[PDB]
Amino acid sequence: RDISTAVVVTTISDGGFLDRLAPALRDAGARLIVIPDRNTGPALFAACERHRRLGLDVVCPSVAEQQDLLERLAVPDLIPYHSDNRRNVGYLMAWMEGFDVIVSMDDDNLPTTDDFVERHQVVCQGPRTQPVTASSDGWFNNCALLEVEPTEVFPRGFPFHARPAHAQARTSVCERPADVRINAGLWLGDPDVDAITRLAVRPNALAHSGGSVVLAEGTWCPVNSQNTAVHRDALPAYYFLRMGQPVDGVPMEKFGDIFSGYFVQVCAQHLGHAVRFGDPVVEHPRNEHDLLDDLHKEVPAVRLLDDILDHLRDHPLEGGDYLETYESLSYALQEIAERVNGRAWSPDARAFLHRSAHLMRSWTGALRTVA
Amino acid sequence: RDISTAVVVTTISDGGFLDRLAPALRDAGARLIVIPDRNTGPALFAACERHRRLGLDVVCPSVAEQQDLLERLAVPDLIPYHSDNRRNVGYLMAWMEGFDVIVSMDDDNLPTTDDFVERHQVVCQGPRTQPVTASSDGWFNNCALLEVEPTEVFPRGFPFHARPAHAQARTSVCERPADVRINAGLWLGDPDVDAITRLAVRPNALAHSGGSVVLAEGTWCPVNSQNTAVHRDALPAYYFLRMGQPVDGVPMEKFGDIFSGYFVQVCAQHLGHAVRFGDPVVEHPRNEHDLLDDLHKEVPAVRLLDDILDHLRDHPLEGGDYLETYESLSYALQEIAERVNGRAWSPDARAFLHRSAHLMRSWTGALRTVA
Amino acid sequence: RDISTAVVVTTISDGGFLDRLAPALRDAGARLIVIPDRNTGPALFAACERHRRLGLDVVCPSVAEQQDLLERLAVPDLIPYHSDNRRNVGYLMAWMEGFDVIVSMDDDNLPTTDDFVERHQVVCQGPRTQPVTASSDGWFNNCALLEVEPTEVFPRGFPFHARPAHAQARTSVCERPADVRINAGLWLGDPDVDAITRLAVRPNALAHSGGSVVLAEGTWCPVNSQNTAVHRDALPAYYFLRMGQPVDGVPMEKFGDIFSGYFVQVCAQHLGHAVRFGDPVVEHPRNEHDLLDDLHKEVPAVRLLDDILDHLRDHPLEGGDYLETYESLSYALQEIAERVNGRAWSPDARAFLHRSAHLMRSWTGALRTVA
Amino acid sequence: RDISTAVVVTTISDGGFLDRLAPALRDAGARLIVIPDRNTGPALFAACERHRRLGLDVVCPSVAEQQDLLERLAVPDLIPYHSDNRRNVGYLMAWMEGFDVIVSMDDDNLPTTDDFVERHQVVCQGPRTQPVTASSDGWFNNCALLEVEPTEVFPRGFPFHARPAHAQARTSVCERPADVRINAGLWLGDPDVDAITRLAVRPNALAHSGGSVVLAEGTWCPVNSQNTAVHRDALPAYYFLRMGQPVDGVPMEKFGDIFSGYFVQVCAQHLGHAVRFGDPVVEHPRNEHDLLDDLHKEVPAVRLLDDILDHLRDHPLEGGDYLETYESLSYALQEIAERVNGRAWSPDARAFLHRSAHLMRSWTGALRTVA
Ligand SMILES: [Mn+2]
Ligand SMILES: [Mn+2]
Ligand SMILES: [Mn+2]
Ligand SMILES: [Mn+2]
């Protein structure tokens, strides 16, 4: 095999999460790329050094080091300096060093099994004839693979127009070729639901009961960046979208991985690749913040997502690899920004897609500069 | 002891709902006050004039008659002309003509029992020793009196900060004196939940199983205007609050009755009166909205309600009747607009309470003009 | 007939302006009340303590002393803590300690004559038959009393709708009884023009040539707080209005004294008092601002002032002194907030008058507490 | 010679302006392309037909005809349907029919001389060695060529950072080769000043006294679309920019020709071509609308223009003709949107350049489809 894996995490904490995260990473010999920020205290740097004494291939480049790498690649203004968007630095660094597997995690996720890194290496098994899951409505609820109380829930980013009729959707499994390049692992405790669902029923994930699935062509499901492995080929299409763009005056937030999860998914299907959902499952403790503020942050993106997802199914792309496909995707978003109709599509909402498309090319242009 | 009842409904439809609503109203000799708007087609007037042929005590004052009435009360600018706020015209007319019971309804509710008016006449039974319900957390979930699928839900306007711990709250019933002047009837089909709950679980209320309760002092529950009887004494405090005020730039909507229900509730309790929940139950069919637009409209008011409800418990009021208590409440809101802190309390959100307090005094000023 | 004068200045600088300002103040034995802010460096306190060694009756209450004072007056939230609105603290202290004349100045004005305090004591001369100036259009351009290059200009706050026809307006002087309680001194160098005029022609006031005038009843002119003496009776109506309220989404700024100057002007005229323009003239050097930012700040208030001034002429007031007249003015503003029409009168702009009216009552409520 | 000229005007009026505009156009045999809108009454169509009886080569394509041409060229959503941006239709139509000179005028401009069309044919004289005007600050005040009362003024779109020092700027004329492709004619009566200047001094253009100038390389001046001739080669770079994009929440307006005037100017200088200012001069009567509303509309663009103009001088372009240069300009604006710094450069302001750049390519892509 001889597979290299790099875990990418951005944080502003003191580094205490490394105590319950390092053992699973250092046992598999995987590299951990911790991306600090301006508002990151010197305790995280000391915590990374201490865990490197204990035998962890951890790196924590200071904001000075990060700005130099982005400066050489002619992208000094691409990544903001007070946001979790800085995880793109860890994406770029792991892609530069040439890792096979890039695992994107948050600083509050804990692996629940010993084979955490091994289960994420499924994106490097290549194309096999394997059971792939299809849905008559083109959507798959990966939260249905879990035991959730008090009621059924959809993951964050799942389109709202498809939820009422999804209970009638036919689900079939067929033995077909598939090349898994993205593996989204599930989460116990507080699942990855949007702020709307969390305020309504406060879901609780008890256990992973549904196993693992591989979605077929035409069946989609939102992919996150808190427990997801991405093959280095698919990483150019995994650019964490920059937030802050106002929709009808209200800036969107906390949806960078919803767009990247769909974008790397659309790009993978154009190249005949698939997305996997299931194991490894992480421990995600419950929240502790302002859920009404989370709602006010997520609504601007939620108002647009259903329209953007519908137009992406009708926009065929081009490209031989992920860089060419992701750029063809950026041009598709600019055409979508002028065709889509709706009350939430004020001039600033349409301009959100146009600036995002430019930032997506600035990301790929920096990757071509590396190569 | 002949009790007179007036039903207030504002609508822009052609008047087809009168075909099914008038039977239960004319069987009790009750008055129906339909309040049309500017865009209300001339077909509603034909339905009202024709349903009066069948014995319905219905009125439908055109916008010319509504504005001539509001001119003489020195309040021409109080009520907007493209909003459901125009139901205040119906409240004013019934209180002018001297009805004992004012039943507020929407144009899509349907009485499910033949005793609809009689069950709403409970707000005239006077004070007597009756079983009253109290709660350790000071909140009562009226939806718990219903059979709701797929999971438990809270009514629209229920404070979000008290929802997680409400399951542990103790509920007791004690024989205590109480005077019911507000009776909020429940609703089958699509229950009155906020847009957050409806997007999440799409609730369906199957039956009324919990019976009727009378809330005690210090126990609150949101009261809407879709199926609520208000005694003529309590009506001055039942002013339907005017929407449209921006909160951090986003205008609020669909919460006029949420503020009115709490305001008439706090005023009733200060005067020794109580609110009742339960019967009569109406049929509110599930109407397919733009639920994302409903969410975008309700979030501005939701961001402030939790703070507003907490301060209204700390602020004692003054007044002998509802007219004096409602004015003291308006001065209390202006004191709250400067006391309160939070991220959602930008200068426009604070000025929303100040403009609302002035409009409430304008509403009571017109009632003092009539009386 | 010993008259006491207090100069009120708020600043965030290091206190270098005291080197040139204190001579004219300590030569007249006048009191200087410097009001620092949170971000005011500790160098200002050394300049005040040291200028008192040279005989200056100066005080500089820290933010701790300012908040302790405002706590006992039940107005802790009245005055923000990062605004020039904190000069209201200086108005409060001088009115508390009982000074006859309160001279409002900025930290960049410089008296050009040795009789600065004496010329400002004109607001204590009492009522006498004196030449008063009237205008056929009801407006007087105080900048016409100055020599301004390169062209004629209007002061900041002058209504725009009356500017084109003001050249045809007739000006007459008549021996009439008048009682001056407000004296607005003029300014050489950079005149007090709005950001619109300054961006256009960059005015430069070379000399004071028109002398002094006393405006008659029905003749108005904006009064600022950069060089204005207010008698202690008129000070309750001189509350520096709080900025920040959004007009159609855009927050207003730099117009607190424009509203205060008109408010104390309308209140003085209802009580039979007059406003004076002319001497003493200060040296206001041209300070290079971000003039585009100044324009963006002043436009919100400018969009409303023309409508507000027109309605304030139609609304008669009540009151025996300034405390009762200023409160009647606040109730008049709430009546105007609903009467007025225009494109710039979105719900947030109307609620700006309602919140301002409450803050004015809070200001007078604290003065009633002191007295 | 054998020169064809097409005058482009968009309007919503009844067509009365054709009475005083047709004689100068029909005498020279020039085509007039009147572009109506949705809110255009049938009187303009009758007025165009009547003037065609009198011998005017006028055309007035209905909104149905306009949408078909844009539909064939795969640009159905490029041009909005309630704006003067529809003059781009007249630009495209005259470019399709192959006119040498395209004269862009407003419906309220009247030629003051008989040689109006002949003086605008100067953009077809080709390159000659002629006196070109240079300025040490790189800016030229074309309003200095007029007699303006009561004081000197700058044209709309002139950068504000350069105005104070422009009085010291050296002006020299040198005999050098120049190919005039854009000729901006001046205007008597109400000049083309921004809303800031018009509210301050209300300028009045008395006569054209300065003659005509041809700006050299590096010397710029804003160009408008109300009295300007554009050679068909330079027309691809004359796309009237679409307004409505919010800057810090405030949408910009009335600045479509300010950006197009600078863009066709920058593109012309890259190709060695020049811009001419002077004759022919038109009659522009005084305004009649809400000048405060004009200010509120123009400020969002004014806050950005000085920054955009500075970066355009430091961004070298590419291209052999105007189509290639205008597209290279669109990519330059996207790089400028991420390099520029300022308080007014909120996320929606930066996204204004990105969407504008996409619309500029959609314009050129439609022109390449025509060819
Ligand atoms: Mn988390
Ligand atoms: Mn309904
Ligand atoms: Mn100053
Ligand atoms: Mn014009």
Author numbering:
A (entry chain C), B (entry chain A), C (entry chain A), D (entry chain C): 4 to 374
Task: Show the paper's wording.
The MtdL subunit is divided into three regions: the N-terminal region (residues 1–111), the core region (residues 112–291), and the C-terminal region (residues 292–376).
We also obtained crystal structures of the catalytically deficient S228A mutant of MtdL in complex with GDP-L-Fucp·Mn2+ and GDP-L-Fucf·Mn2+, respectively, and the R257K mutant bound with Mn2+. Arg257 directly hydrogen bonds to the β-phosphate. Moreover, Arg257 interacts with both the sugar and the β-phosphate moieties of the substrate. It is a critical substrate-binding residue since no electron density was observed whether for the GDP or for the D-Glcp moiety in the structure of MtdL-R257K·Mn2+ cocrystallized with GDP-D-Glcp, consistent with abrogated mutase activity of R257K. Because Asp109, Gln229, and Arg257 interact with both the GDP and the sugar moieties, the almost abrogated mutase activity of the D109N, Q229A, and R257K mutants might be due to significantly decreased binding of these mutants to GDP-sugar substrate.
